[PDB]
């Protein structure tokens, strides 16, 4: 399933996942192993980033994706995908893009991996909000 406004239903059970208590411009710092972190906001722009940007490198404020509210539910996790970030330094003109996977936890996000060859950033966040 996919749905807008920072919420999605599990069509099997009619359970509504709602990430909107994580929303707002103050946002969060995603931890990063190689260097400073990433400012990020859930389902909206981060005030520490350029207009409309949901996540950006904390050192430079360079965009790693425009915010949107399209929450997906897939293989038992919630995902947001911020597209159209800044241009990445690789082979073809590729723009950054952030994937934010929320997994169930019966808590800050982490940047776990950065695909250099697709300029995709993968984040994880363990949260009781993705539980069912």
UniProtKB/Swiss-Prot annotation:
Post-translational modification: Palmitoylated. Undergoes cysteine S-palmitoylation which promotes interaction with the retromer cargo-selective complex which mediates its retrograde trafficking to the Golgi apparatus.
Highest taxon in the source lineage: Eukaryota
Domain MRH positions: 4-132
Record text on subunit structure and interactions: Binds HA-I and HA-II plasma membrane adapters. Interacts with DPP4; the interaction is direct. Binds GGA1, GGA2 and GGA3. Interacts with the heterotrimeric retromer cargo-selective complex (CSC), formed by VPS26 (VPS26A or VPS26B), VPS29 and VPS35; which is involved in retrograde trafficking of the receptor from endosomes to the Golgi apparatus.
Domain observations: Contains 15 repeating units of approximately 147 AA harboring four disulfide bonds each. The most highly conserved region within the repeat consists of a stretch of 13 AA that contains cysteines at both ends.
Similarity section: Belongs to the MRL1/IGF2R family.
Role summary: Mediates the transport of phosphorylated lysosomal enzymes from the Golgi complex and the cell surface to lysosomes. Lysosomal enzymes bearing phosphomannosyl residues bind specifically to mannose-6-phosphate receptors in the Golgi apparatus and the resulting receptor-ligand complex is transported to an acidic prelysosomal compartment where the low pH mediates the dissociation of the complex. The receptor is then recycled back to the Golgi for another round of trafficking through its binding to the retromer. This receptor also binds IGF2.
Protein name: Cation-independent mannose-6-phosphate receptor
Whole-protein residues included: 1511 to 1647 of 2491
């Amino acid at each position: 399933n996919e749905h807008d406004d920072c919420q999605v239903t599990n069509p099997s059970t009619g359970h509504l996942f709602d990430l909107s208590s994580l929303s707002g411009r103050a946002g969060f710092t995603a931890a990063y192993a190689k260097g400073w972190g990433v400012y990020m906001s859930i389902c909206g722009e981060n005030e520490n980033c350029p207009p409309g940007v949901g996540a950006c490198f904390g050192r430079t404020r360079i965009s790693v994706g425009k915010a949107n509210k399209r929450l997906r539910y897939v293989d038992q996790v919630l995902q947001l995908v911020y597209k159209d970030g800044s241009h990445c330094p690789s082979k073809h003109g590729l723009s950054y893009k952030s994937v934010i996977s929320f997994v169930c936890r019966p808590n800050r996000p982490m940047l776990i991996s950065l695909d250099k060859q697709t300029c995709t950033l993968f984040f994880s966040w363990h949260t009781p909000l993705a539980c069912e």
